[PDB]
Structure formats: structure tokens, C-alpha cells
From a paper:
Group II GLKs are ATP-dependent enzymes that lack the classical repressor open reading frame kinase (ROK) sequence motif and contain more than 50 partial and complete protein sequences, including Escherichia coli GLK. To date, there are no ecGLK structures reported together with the other substrate ATP or the product ADP. This work presents the structure of apo ecGLK bound with phosphate and the structure of ecGLK in complex with both glucose and phosphate, implying a role for phosphate in regulation of the GLK activity. In the ternary complex, phosphate is bound adjacent to glucose, and the B factors for the α4, α5 and α9 helices were further reduced, while r.m.s.d. spikes were observed at the end of the β10 sheet and within the α6 helix of the β-domain. This structural characterization suggests that phosphate could influence the activity of GLK by altering glucose binding and modulating interactions with a loop-interacting regulatory protein.
Here, we report the crystal structure of Escherichia coli glucokinase (GLK), which has phosphate bound in the cleft between the α and β domains adjacent to the active site. The phosphate-bound ecGLK structure from the P43212 crystal form was determined by molecular replacement and refined to an R factor of 0.1930 (Rfree = 0.2302) at a resolution of 2.65 Å. The phosphate-bound complex is composed of a dimer, with each monomer featuring an α/β domain characterized by noncontiguous segments: the small domain (residues 2–110 and 300–321) and the large domain (residues 111–299). The phosphate-binding site is found on the edge of the small and large domain cleft outside the α4–α10 cluster. His183, Ser185 and Glu187 exhibit distinct conformational changes upon phosphate binding.
Numbering used by the authors:
A (entry chain B), B (entry chain A): 2 to 321
The structure:
């Protein structure tokens, strides 16, 4: 058959599309609100009837941990067993992968207009790749090319210990360690991480924080209306660089460091002028090591759908 | 041919031996001093004539980064070209790998008597593996099993930003940051790292350090004759755990975390009584994640010779 089902479920939104098995091309993308449907398979059934095409294979990416037949969404009230949905749909293959796996698998399919470069030279072919994004949480994955095939290396890299460098970063660690216990990088590189950076900075002045959400941190920083909001956003960009620099040092990722969407596009212009690349290269003797490594921001509209098709096609035996 | 030459060359000494291409067994190992011979070629020639063996393939592990055809070592008189040496020796395959790459490739060859487990459950076959060792510097490598083949991922992971967790670790960062600026993990997890920890502890207590070498720190700590040295060795063991746990989270190293010799065997009993494993699992919500990941200390005599044979045999088509 010519088409397989591809998906990208991210909380309240379920995006489904058709993927050409021969080419990996995505088409007929439809987005359904998860609040209007009781199950993911209910959406898939509605989508399959509308396009009147027969599919036997499928690969859906979900923004939740996937290990075990029972997939449970972070807050959304969708939970299912992969085998039950496999039997109910009559599917030959039903791949259910983490959303960050799919995003990493889309990188071999991306062209340069889907990327924005932040410093560095050209990538080195055949070298490892680091992918990380700061959204609701801190997703981290790695990409390695072995024998014409792309293997995805998953993990929970977002929960490694936060590593402060400057003075200002050290006071933040001290404040957070007093409230929470171990302080992971996710506590400062994420949606809630922006608030944590804000709340820590306000308490650094021996004051009490004001209650506002990450969306209020961003536009107040961009409007120059709250001095603390711009301070936290600038520190968030610096910490994003330091984190990305550690990733490149650890795995020698001369294929590139990729930022996967998240909250960064909400302040793209502010991010462009920050000390992100400076903190990325602030590695002591090994600035020259990561100096030439390029950092790209993925601006492709649907990397989850693209990478789900790439992973499924490789599963079925195609070479990307 | 039955035998291939394998080698493990450092700053001053070159160890060469024979590898049974069928079994991977290392035999007839001899160490030569690089001050008595003008080139690495000369040492290989005298070995092959004083052992009367006749090899066609060889693989040598060198304690310096391998970037290109020219190998620039610490023994500058021995700097050579890979292609030139291959033509001079008449070899059909001459693989030149980093010393820490060879140690990581010894993992598939190691028996139970060469490993001491430090916590964790059984390893999961086919899952990634993290290797690190604290010697003169901090070497970090990763192993991935793809299509019946073991691939080594090199990097400079020992130079990522040091991540303090406890309040005592935070003050160490402040002390060192005022001296050298960027504080990588190598500045605490190494032979010189012991001295740095010792100086930072006494400086935190408003006292003046002595001019001690790493061997002094371990000696006083094991003899309980210096509380400063004892605290330094205790903190080293704890930071050793935290660093390894960060590696495990980042790449999901369910195939195990391996400590490659270094200075740890010199205080093995002190290491066993330390809070190493507890610091390894001090990962907040993800203590349960790294709880099942096993940690092994490698106590093999010559892992570089063992791993060099493994890499060469894999390159020659054999499956480990």
C-alpha cells in the first residue's frame, strides 16, 4: 500500500496525517482537539473514514513516556494499550514513540530553510547529533548514523544536575535547593523553569516574588516593563547555551546541536541577541572544541509527523 | 593470519602484544620505554623480530586525540603519520584509536572476575553503555550496540561544567571559579582534581594549603592522618557518583556504567565504604530511574590491549 498513518499528539491536540511509504512525504494533515473525543483510536477512526484510504501501518508520537503497552498521557485523560488499539484498528504495525524521538528522527529529512543557525561552522557528516528543547519539560535525545541507518538514543537527560557557572547562577541553585531537593536542569530550562528563574531572582533581592506564569515572563521581558522578567529571560538563554555546550562536549556532536521548538520561538528576536552562543562556547580550554559546532533551531512546522514517518519507514526496511 | 599486533602507547612507555584473531586472546606482552627508541615503528620492529611472529594487521591505542592522519602525541619525537607507518610496516590494516576508545571496546570482552559491581540490577542487553575513568584527566566514552556491532562514541565529556549539588560542593565551585574561571568536571575528578579539592576545602576554612601531590592526599586519607585529605577523598567519591548518574540519565545507559581503572583502585576499600552509589542515585524524581542501572569498576590489567584487539577483530569482520 502507498500510505501509512502518521501522528503527533501533544496534550490537547492530536495531529494525524498520511505518509507515503516510498518517499516519506507527509500529506493530508488534520488536527483534532483531544477534548472532543474520548480516545485516540476514536480520532484515528474518524480520520481514516474521511480520507477513504486503506492503511495497515502507523506511527504516532506522544509527548509522554512510552514504555509498556499502557500509554498514559501527562495530564490529558487519554490512556490506552498499544495492543488493544492495534487489534481494534486491524493494523500490521503500530509504532508508538516519544515525541522527542520523532523530532530527532526528522533531522535527516530537514532542509536548510527549516533551520536557523546560531554560530558555528558547517556540520560534519556521519558525526553524532544532539537534540534538546525547553517546553513543558526538558527533552533531550541523540542521533547517530550507523551502516546507512539512523538510530535514536533516548534518555532522561533533562534531569541531570543543574550546573551553574557564574555567580548569579550559583545563587539561583542555592535558592532552589532550599525549596526543592535535587535541582535538575529541567527546573531552569522549561516553561516552569522560567518562573523558577524569576522567583529565585526576586528572592535574591530579599523580596517576595509576584505570581505570574511563563507567558507573563516572556512578554513583560520583551516589553521592558519588568526588569526581573528580562533578567530571567536573559539568564534562561545563557543557561540554554551552557547546557547545549555540555551536550556537544559529551558526545562529540559535530553533526550539530538542534533546538526543538518549545518556548524559544516565542522570543526568537530576544534569543537571537542573547549570550546563548557565548555561554555555549564558555568551556575553558575546550572553547575551540565546540567553537565550530553549529547550533540550529528547527522551524519546520511538523517535525513530529515527519520524524514519525522516518522512524516507521526505517522500521519497515527503508533507508533514509 | 593467526596473530595481529595490538598496542597501548602512553607518554613514555609502549606496551605491545599479540592478538589471536580467532579468540581475541592477548599474549606475549612486553613494555618498551619510548626514550630508548627513536620511533614507534622501531619498537614494533624489534618486537616482531624478538618474538618471530609475522603479523599483517595491527591496532594501537594511543593516549592522545586522533584527529587525522598525523598523530601528535606527548612524546613529540614519536609524532608520525598513520599512512606512512602503514606503508613502512607493510600492514594491510593499521587502526589507530584513542586510549579511552580502546578501553571502552574492552567491555564486550570482560569476564566477571574483571568487574566489581557497585549497586544496580542486571544489565539490559543491547542498551547503551557509559564509560568514564579518573586518572591524570577525565575520560568519557559511550558504547552503543547496533546490528551485532559495537560502536564507540568518543568525546570530551570530562570537560563539561562541574555541577555542584550539596552546599559544600557549591563552595568548592566558588573557590575554584575565582582561580581558573570555568570549572569542568576534570578539575575535581582526576589526580590533579584531588589536589584542587584539598586546596578548596582548606581555603574554605580560612587556612593555607600545603604543596601536596595526589598520592599525598590518598595516603593521608587512607591513614586518617589529615582531616582535610579525608574530606577531599570522601567528596571525590561522592562527585564520582553524581557524575556517573548524570551520564546514565543522559543516554539511558541501561547496559551499564563502567569505571575505567584510573586512581580508584588505589583506594578501593575507601571507595567501597564511601557514599558513591547513594550520590549516583541522588537524582530527585529519577532516583528510581537510575536505581536499576548497574555500575562496575574494571580491574583488568591491560584493558587497552584487550580493547584494541576487539576493535581490530570487529574491523576485520568478526562479531564480538
Amino acid at each position: 500500500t502507498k500510505y501509512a498513518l502518521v501522528g503527533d499528539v501533544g496534550g490537547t491536540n492530536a495531529r494525524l496525517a498520511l505518509c507515503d511509504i516510498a518517499s516519506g512525504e507527509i500529506s493530508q494533515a488534520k488536527t483534532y482537539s483531544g477534548l472532543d473525543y474520548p480516545s485516540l483510536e476514536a480520532v484515528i477512526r474518524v480520520y481514516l473514514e474521511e480520507h477513504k484510504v486503506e492503511v495497515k501501518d502507523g506511527c504516532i508520537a506522544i509527548a509522554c513516556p512510552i514504555t509498556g503497552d499502557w500509554v498514559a498521557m501527562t495530564n490529558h485523560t487519554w490512556a490506552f494499550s498499544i495492543a488493544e488499539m492495534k487489534k481494534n484498528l486491524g493494523f500490521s504495525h503500530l509504532e508508538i514513540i516519544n515525541d522527542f524521538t520523532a523530532v530527532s528522527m526528522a533531522i535527516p529529512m530537514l532542509k536548510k530553510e527549516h533551520l536557523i543557525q546560531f554560530g558555528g561552522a558547517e556540520p560534519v557528516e556521519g558525526k553524532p547529533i544532539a537534540v534538546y528543547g525547553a517546553g513543558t519539560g526538558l527533552g533531550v535525545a541523540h542521533l547517530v548514523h550507523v551502516d546507512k541507518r539512523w538510530v535514536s538514543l533516548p534518555g532522561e537527560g533533562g534531569h541531570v544536575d543543574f550546573a551553574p557557572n557564574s555567580e548569579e547562577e550559583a545563587i539561583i541553585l542555592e535558592i532552589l535547593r532550599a525549596e526543592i531537593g535535587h535541582v535538575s536542569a529541567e527546573r531552569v530550562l522549561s516553561g516552569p523553569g522560567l518562573v523558577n528563574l524569576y522567583r529565585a531572582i526576586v528572592k535574591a533581592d530579599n523580596r517576595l516574588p509576584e505570581n505570574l506564569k511563563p507567558k507573563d515572563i516572556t512578554e513583560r521581558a520583551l516589553a521592558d516593563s519588568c526588569t526581573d522578567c528580562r533578567r530571567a529571560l536573559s539568564l534562561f538563554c545563557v543557561i540554554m547555551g551552557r547546557f547545549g555546550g555540555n551536550l556537544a562536549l559529551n558526545l562529540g556532536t559535530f553533526g550539530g546541536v538542534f533546538i526543538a521548538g518549545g518556548i524559544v520561538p516565542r522570543f526568537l528576536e530576544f534569543f537571537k541577541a542573547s549570550g546563548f552562543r557565548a555561554a555555549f562556547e564558555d568551556k575553558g580550554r575546550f572553547k575551540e572544541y565546540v567553537h565550530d559546532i553549529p547550533v540550529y533551531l528547527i522551524v519546520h512546522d511538523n517535525p513530529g509527523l515527519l520524524g514519525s514517518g522516518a522512524h516507521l519507514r526505517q522500521t519497515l526496511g527503508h533507508i533514509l
